[PDB]
Amino acid sequence: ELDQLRQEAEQLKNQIRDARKACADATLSQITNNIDPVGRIQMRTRRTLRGHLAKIYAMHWGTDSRLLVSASQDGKLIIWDSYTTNKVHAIPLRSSWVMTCAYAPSGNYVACGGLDNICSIYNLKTREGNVRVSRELAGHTGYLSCCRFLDDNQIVTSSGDTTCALWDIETGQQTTTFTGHTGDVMSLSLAPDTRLFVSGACDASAKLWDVREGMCRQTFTGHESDINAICFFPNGNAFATGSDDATCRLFDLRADQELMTYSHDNIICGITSVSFSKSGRLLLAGYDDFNCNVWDALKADRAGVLAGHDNRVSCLGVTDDGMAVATGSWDSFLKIWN
Amino acid sequence: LGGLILFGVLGNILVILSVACHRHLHSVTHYYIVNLAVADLLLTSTVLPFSAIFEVLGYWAFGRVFCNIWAAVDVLCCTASIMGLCIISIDRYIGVSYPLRYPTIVTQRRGLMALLCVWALSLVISIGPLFGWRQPAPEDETICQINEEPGYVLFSALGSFYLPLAIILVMYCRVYVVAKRESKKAAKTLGIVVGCFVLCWLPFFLVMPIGSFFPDFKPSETVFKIVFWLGYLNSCINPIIYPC
Amino acid sequence: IAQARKLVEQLKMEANIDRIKVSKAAADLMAYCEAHAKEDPLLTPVPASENPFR
Amino acid sequence: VSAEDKAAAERSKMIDKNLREDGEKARRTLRLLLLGADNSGKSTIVKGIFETKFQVDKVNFHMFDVGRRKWIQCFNDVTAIIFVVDSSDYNRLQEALNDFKSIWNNRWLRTISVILFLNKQDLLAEKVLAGKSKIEDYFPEFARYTTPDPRVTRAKYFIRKEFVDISTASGDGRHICYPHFTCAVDTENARRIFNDCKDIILQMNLREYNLV
Amino acid sequence: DVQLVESGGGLVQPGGSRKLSCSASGFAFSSFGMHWVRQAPEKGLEWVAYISSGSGTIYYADTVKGRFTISRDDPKNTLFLQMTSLRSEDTAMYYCVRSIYYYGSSPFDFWGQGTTLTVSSDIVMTQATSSVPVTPGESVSISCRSSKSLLHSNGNTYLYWFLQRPGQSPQLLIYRMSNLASGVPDRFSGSGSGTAFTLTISRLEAEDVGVYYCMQHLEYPLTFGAGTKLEL
Ligand SMILES: CS(=O)(=O)Nc1c(O)ccc2c1CCC[C@@H]2C1=NCCN1
């Protein structure tokens, strides 16, 4: 019985690989070979945010493209006004070990989590004038590595117990569980329509999940190490992953296969963060060699380097209007580039 | 001449910028390096150009009112630099003798107190001549002369070099004892650190009281200028070695 | 034993997805990138008057 | 430039002051990462994520026990790692050595010193005296090893020699292992951790001051 | 839950001294800036004084500067206004108003009750209308004018609208000329440009009668309007 099922699974994987091969006539490099190159891009540090006294792990932009939130080892979740570099809020965290933070699309809530296996959601708009914790989602049996808001009441989290979860903040219990990863899930990216999302794990695998039914639709492989970062294309028909093998990869949902690989012989260090520009032409990739790189997502050519951090770059995000890029690092400084 | 001023100002500005560029410089041991760099920057930016113009022209140009102030800012900057070296040595001694009690001994709201006390003592020493205790000024304003009043020379020289020197020597001897006990690398480093300070300041602070109290053994003007500029050399050299 | 059955069920579910050619998807991505070139403040420098971060 | 902007800036400065106060308060604590494995007795070495705080000589130590592949990079700035090994069980000794080698050669722990705690030495002595199980059965090198009861001392020194052989290889002196032998009824582990942390901080300060 | 009670007041001889107290409860009093605003027995609202969070900044109106001193005791959650040499023009009703200042905040959101006191250049805000008779269910508009443009270089138009119902303390309706205060029905809307603003209410209902005030927060001193009185 077990041998028959294993042989059937091998046959199914061979069929999937053959189907993917049959639907690969050209390549993204060949099609965009006659396109006009982006050229040289030189962003400069417009703002430098100081006030964190330890390594910064996560950073999320608000939907107004002006407020942002960052989380550090000092037990601090700081909400900054990026235009004037004014600390709008400073939230003390119950657990000093936090690896992720999120900003609600409405701007009324923030979220954080880490080695405590809890997702703490803090309400920012209270009559008392202080930021209080609104909810504490529990149920994951591993550390939380990412969390993203869908509404003011629904949040998707990825944990180190090889599972993802869609919660209900009002009730405080999981409404959907996403299983199928064998290693720890390190990142997740919500689709622009918020009907699907993608999760990358330590098994060098990315999975596309449908939020409604709650099952994996497509599985993407090709990395040779743990996937640390993942981000959706602006139109929601593709996504990009960064891994510890010093490579970035672009996968297409409709083609169900890899399109482009962004790597260089000089780079031998893993990617900690990844993001897309508003147009999707630029892929921002943060590395642990103390600097970030900009890739021409259609030509796989490095269009510029964001340097100015003296330690490992941990988080990297782009505003919804595409004005600026915020990059955090382990030197406790997060910078804004334009 | 000018090259020394440029080198010193560039080194001090670079040290100041580099300290603020990273948050690892949040401890008092970097505040002290910032204080030393600020003192040397102020010196090489304000005092040193006037001294070089004095050496080039050979006569005061800013006037008696505007050169008597130059005889006090120079003292203030030099004393501030020397006491900055002293507090750096004290901080290193406390950090070496008490490793895990250093944060609860050398604390902000106390390191800042030491930082302010250094400049307080520097200004107390330097406001001597400005309030009257100085030699009778010459009638000709085109000449500007140092304050060779024996009492002021003794007091300023003592409280500016000899009092800091004893503290530096004691603290660094204890640091050397601990370093050799806890385990030649420390010997060379401490030797360089002490030797730069001594070779730069001891000649001037030895030939000054000698000329002030023993006119028979008064040295020449050329060696006087050399030992005068050795302090400027110390100010220019401090950012080369102390941050590194 | 049930793990293998779940795995083969998942593989059968993922093997029924209809896949378009790589050329069509690449063309769609290129068209999306071209249609929004003028709306990307990072791709092309913005004059300092309209730049929020000076 | 605006009154509301000025008030917001004043609020930001107050937040900055509070953050610096909390950071200064938090700099006076030393954090230890407690590692090991089950049956090693790591929980009783000192009398989500588990935390413990103990004070000695007006110094506060925080020991964190998680439960070591991905999250361990979060502990790249701790003062020391307390590794606990159960030396009584020779069956798992090679597993413990492999785990210690993995911890020692980790890229995010290349500057962290390890305070090794060879736990349950009384059980090791009892097993050696009984003679039912022989170390040479699992480690063939014990046959020709001689100590610098004599048999218990020889076995203990052989185990410590194996761990120090793992440590000193590819160490370069940037972090030092501090082996110790401990029993369940021992009560001097806090003092040993205090002394080892003092040595670690002293070496850090000496390296900072460009000394030895 | 949020409550600002006031104590003191009463009859004061001219030239005397009096200390008004404002006790806070139900909110983080330490993080809120505080204002004292007085209303004459038959006139509009007059801004008296302001103390920042942490007592780092204090402002007074030129009418009371020198004679009034504002202070706060954070551990006791108390606000004090010490007044000396009280003239006969200082008889009013005093309110302590909380206001927190950060990006997107709503200053003057909560006003305390009133404490009575009977003693025996600046930007001018103009409310041309002094009384508008209206009927329920009919949309009306209140106009206000500014001598200087309240629009700032940062894009914010620092204009605030307040409603004082008969026998009740003022409450914030609209802040920064467009944003709607929390708890205020969507029947209120605010529009206008520099030096000319309007507040439009559609489907007027009961409990909306009373006085409407336009205040500017561009620069101290803070000045109110005359007050447009909507009556049935
Ligand atoms: C020797 S003194 O008692 O006259 N006062 C004093 C001082 O302590 C320290 C440096 C100095 C002076 C005076 C004259 C300027 C002299 C100096 N400035 C640059 C290097 N050397």
Numbering used by the authors:
A (entry chain B): 3 to 340
B (entry chain R): 33 to 215, 268 to 328
C (entry chain G): 9 to 62
D (entry chain A): 5 to 51, 68 to 87, 93 to 173, 183 to 246
E (entry chain F): 1 to 120, 124 to 235
Question: What's written in the study?
Answer:
In the complex of A61603–α1A-AR–Gq, S1885.43 forms multiple interactions with A61603. The hydroxyl group of S1885.43 forms H-bonds with the hydroxy attached to the tetrahydronaphthalene group, the amide, and the oxygen atom of the methanesilfonamide group of A61603. There are also extensive hydrophobic interactions between A61603 and α1A-AR. These include V1073.33, C1103.36, I17845.52, W2856.48, F2886.51, F2896.52, M2926.55, F3127.38, G3157.41 and Y3167.42. To further probe the structural basis for the specificity of A61603 for α1A-AR, we compared the ligand-binding pockets of all three α1-AR subtypes. In the A61603–α1A-AR–Gq structure, these three residues form a hydrophobic surface surrounding the methanesulfonamide group of A61603. Based on our cryo-EM structure of the active state of α1A-AR with A61603 and the structure of the inactive state of α1B-AR, the modeled A61603–α1B-AR complex showed a steric clash between the methanesulfonamide group of A61603 and L3146.55. The largest structural changes upon activation occur on the cytoplasmic side of α1-AR, with an outward rotation of TM6 by ~10 Å (measured at the Cα of A6.33) (The superscript is the Ballesteros-Weinstein numbering), and an inward ~5 Å movement of TM7 (measured at the Cα of Y7.53).
α1-adrenergic receptors (α1-ARs) play critical roles in the cardiovascular and nervous systems where they regulate blood pressure, cognition, and metabolism. α1-ARs couple to the Gq family of G-proteins, leading to the stimulation of phospholipase C-β to cleave phosphatidylinositol-4,5-bisphosphate into inositol-1,4,5-trisphosphate and 2-diacylglycerol.
